[PDB]
Symmetry: D3
Subunit: 237 residues, 6 copies
């Protein structure tokens, strides 16, 4: 066991899908995995392992923010033999042409967190996904007939930002979605020697204030999950 | 309701105790509150409202890290009329004279997060508790026969730090405990005009294994909760 | 002797009161202390040691700014056995509910100096006073019929700041008074393991500009010194 | 004409290959392009336009360093209708398993330059290539039977770095090649609304001190050029 | 009058000499100036105005540190028509070829203060003296048979720095003397459109520690003042 | 030979004039030097060595930007015995009183580059010229009947700045000219123990179009070169 996960080596698959919400992890396990068993509930951070089309797969929540997801991803990598992390989540859009429920794939993640500066002697670390994983997700999406944009996410420390003008800067630089984890997960993957990808569904628009409900985010982002799961199968081949 | 809390105005008391673990919020409500009812379960972040010695009190988890607790504390203050937040958590010690099971009260919180620099034009914001709340907690501890230590916490973004050298720096400058939230909560309190306090119990020494028993650790945890609750009664008058 | 203090161990009390204006030290010695003796004259920074109600107390100016007061406070702590420093000064106010002649006690001190970032590996050190000293001052004021406000000061490097907009930021975050020393003194206290407190009287309101009499100013200054001295006696118990 | 390019709209193809060395641009034009004509020689920064397998293509030097290449790429984008920039260059390796003449494709570029912080309100901008361009280069390489790694480059401001320890940090974080332009080109592409990719050939090893000569770099990195040119043809389809 | 100078326009010459130690102002006035009159006494910072070989000159201490000298130099320039400020002080040396009692002229001043970053949008402002003033001082020294070294000073915020290794960095980059004011004075001069120069005599060698006589110190101090005064006359032509 | 210069020790004089444009290095050699021979052509960065009034002198382009000129200046100093570098360039003006065709001598150079912070432990290094070289240039200009202005340059990383607000800041703090190299050259000179100076002619006003003729601009450029060359002769004695 690790300080935040009460499980043993072998309980997790070598690939783990991770939404922020543990209730969404539960939904994914019930809806997409066969013979799913619960493998963690420490701090209510539910994790499950089962199979998808014969392939062993785990799904576990990571909580909100870089510090939360950094703990869970680290522990999975160092103590549970996890090789790939696929974050499956929600984000807010800043671009006019990005719509609710659009799927975005974060090949890179910008951030206002200090965690990567702490790692990288206060220089600019480009927090990037694993290329093969990105390509796998793009291909899986195309096969499912689901549109997906590939580009930069922005991982925010403050959901309620006191700097509204920064959204104009994100928009200027083509940021596809604002979320709170990607740059941290990519930093952990680099630090601890694993591979990661973040896929998000646009759950709200930062400009229009249109948004999905809590229940919607928990149990209604299915296209993203299919993309993630099918992308793993492509990577296996 | 807010995006992260499915409740309405009035469902929370004007004071909320907040552990990081939602299962610990349930623990506190069941152990210390009468007539407690669950008032939130979005993302599994359990919140409850009940009475302590006739006084309406809420308790709700905040999750791990500054970005997680910043979401919940902001929402409680701006949308649920909450006037006081008391974080009740665990911390690690760096000072040799600070022992396992000491109760630490964070009058200030240092941090390696960028959130307060973002708020404060890249200058140094001293993230501080409300003085009257600190005084109420110190007095409640004294009434219970406990000598709390009052000083600085350090709120870390990385539980698994790559630095390591920073622990010697914390020790040099007298930091009493290392946790992951206080500086963020204090920043939110200042930004939105409310009051906050963090109390922690020392759960480990970034150092040896000083060795206690489960019964003793659990007793001290309960003492921290009693301190928090009694401090509210003192503040009321 | 030290580079800036021509005295020997024992010449200073373990508690030193420090005004910014060196002329105030002699005034304090003659007005409040019994049997005062001169203990320093280097650079005209006169220092005196005497008793207040039998308790050994010293007084010496600190000069304007963090670098000046950092020199004197360091030397006092490391070479003269000083345990407590109480800065007694003036500040400017940014909050409209904070009035001329109000007494402000700096439990914390924000700053635009780099000195604490230099100490603390470029992270945020919360520059804080000693809690008991804060509470002693509050209690001493109350006994004198004075209601002190306790909160954050802002310690400026530039009295004449080219960033006028920073005062609005200070106001938003609840800064009680603007001065030029507290964060530096608190940083030295932490670095060398001693205790400090800054008490200020509001001499100006930054935005507007109202007026006061010389007699009103002396009365208020005397009140602050009385608070400081009585607070020491409470600290001794 | 622009301040650093004496040409007119239409003189450049919508895709420009750019090595740092203008003499290499000359070599590429002579060796790979048909009917090549020189279109710029301001400051000796040679640029040419011709065809590759019927496709109009330009090649022009960009000079050494972020500030130099930022000028040329900006001007091409804003005044010459250039849609894609493919940097074709050299880099130094830090990883043990990366060998001389290996081809590396920079999906991302880390940097110690301040240029992207200036663009991005002092936050972390992940300087990334266009995904389709990366995928095109990977596919072209596979078709040519040439191995290519995809990952992060590091764009240095100082070729002669006073901080040798930073190479250990680059190695730790899996940096594939150290060069001096990629992060700047990616920043310009984002700022001015175009697409970019950097492909490099390992010309020296920072640890082993093995290196290619000046003449070698100028006229002997042919596999990289074929990859770049063939990748354009794939993008056209 | 200004907040720190109780004088009116015309009371100060257009050139002011400023030692750090306020006691030195009266010494300079009595020793070098004719017909001196007292023009300030606020906070014991005595100021005087007289003539040297018929030329109107003022002298007043500036206190220790950038924040102190920044207050006085600003007020002198904006409210008293002062055109030139010459700081005359002491410094510590890090270069072994720089000896006790050497005269150093700061054409530039490095710093670890944040004041110039605050002025200059967080970029690097090169804090420099006025060139003619530098050359005047060099020429005045030469006429007196003194060979002054001209180069960079380092203006420290912390006389007691916790970063001992910075002295090695200063040595490597050719810093001639360490003091606490020059960069601040040069920043004020640029901000308010005036001219400044810092001249220092080496009082200590940071690494080692050799000795000197009181008589040697006064001789060297007098030499520095003579250089400063004669340099003004050269500047007038 | 070095990686960027194909020459051997002795091929360069101990003083090298450096324009940004290699074609301008050829211009200078042909116009002002006798018996000039080309000594470098790697990357088209032409360098030449000849005599001026019997004195051995070299001239070689440095390319645009701090990173480019830092490579060439370092190599000249460490591998070719070069003792003095004189950059001879163009700059843009921000001050209304600084006119087209003024000759500006950079005693200091401000910058938005990070290179000197990397050298100097993230503090402010005042990037300065060699005093004797500045004095020699001023004297040579006077002998030729030109009044050079001596002050700060600003060395920009982005010729095409997204800021724009920074030009007002430069004007406020008295910057004489904006170019792209001086601060980097001065940093290299300090790091490797040599001497440097930057002289520029004002080619544009970041402001209007003041309007000159080609003949007049070219005359002033030649005057700058004459100043540089004659200054060397003065330095020799
Ligand atoms: N507009 C927005 N801003 C920031 N984060 C989010 C999210 C994601 O959802 C959580 C906050 O609601 C957190 O995990 C974040 O990654 N959805 N919409 C967002
Ligand atoms: N040594 C330590 N370091 C960081 N955080 C913690 C904690 C707290 O527990 C959580 C991480 O386990 C987080 O909420 C933090 O505040 N206990 N001990 C800690
Ligand atoms: N509005 C203001 N801003 C900055 N400092 C002060 C002070 C104090 O007075 C001194 C400057 O006049 C300095 O020691 C500072 O702490 N009073 N009012 C102030
Ligand atoms: N070890 C190394 N470090 C930095 N840059 C380079 C290069 C590239 O070559 C140029 C410097 O030689 C410059 O354009 C840079 O991008 N090759 N090898 C390099
Ligand atoms: N080694 C040293 N470090 C810092 N400052 C000084 C000084 C000057 O003396 C004062 C501190 O003693 C201050 O004004 C500073 O400019 N002399 N020697 C010094
Ligand atoms: N307004 C301006 N801004 C930046 N650089 C320059 C220059 C110089 O010319 C080059 C850019 O054209 C570069 O070497 C720089 O130093 N002239 N005018 C300039």
């Amino acid at each position: 066991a690790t300080p935040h996960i009460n499980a043993e080596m072998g309980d997790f698959a070598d690939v783990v899908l991770m939404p922020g919400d543990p209730l969404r992890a539960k939904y994914i396990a019930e809806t997409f995995l066969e013979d799913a068993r619960e493998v963690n509930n420490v701090r209510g951070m539910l994790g499950f392992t089962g199979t998808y089309k014969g392939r062993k797969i785990s799904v576990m929540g990571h909580g909100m923010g870089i510090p939360s997801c950094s703990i869970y991803t680290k522990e999975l990598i160092t103590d549970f033999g996890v090789k790939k992390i696929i974050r499956v989540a929600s984000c807010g859009a800043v671009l006019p042409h990005v719509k609710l429920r659009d799927v975005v794939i974060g090949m890179g993640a910008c951030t206002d967190s200090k965690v990567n500066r702490i790692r990288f002697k206060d220089h600019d670390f480009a927090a990037i996904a694993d290329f093969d994983m990105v390509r796998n997700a793009v291909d899986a999406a195309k096969a499912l007939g689901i549109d997906a944009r590939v580009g930069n996410l922005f991982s925010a420390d403050l959901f309620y930002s006191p700097d509204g003008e920064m959204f104009d800067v994100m928009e200027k630089y083509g940021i596809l979605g604002v979320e709170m984890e990607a740059a941290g997960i990519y930093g952990v993957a680099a630090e601890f020697g694993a591979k990661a990808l973040t896929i998000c569904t646009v759950s709200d628009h930062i400009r229009t204030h249109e948004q999905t409900t809590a229940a919607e985010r928990q149990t209604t982002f299915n296209d993203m999950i299919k993309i993630a799961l099918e992308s793993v199968l492509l990577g296996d081949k």
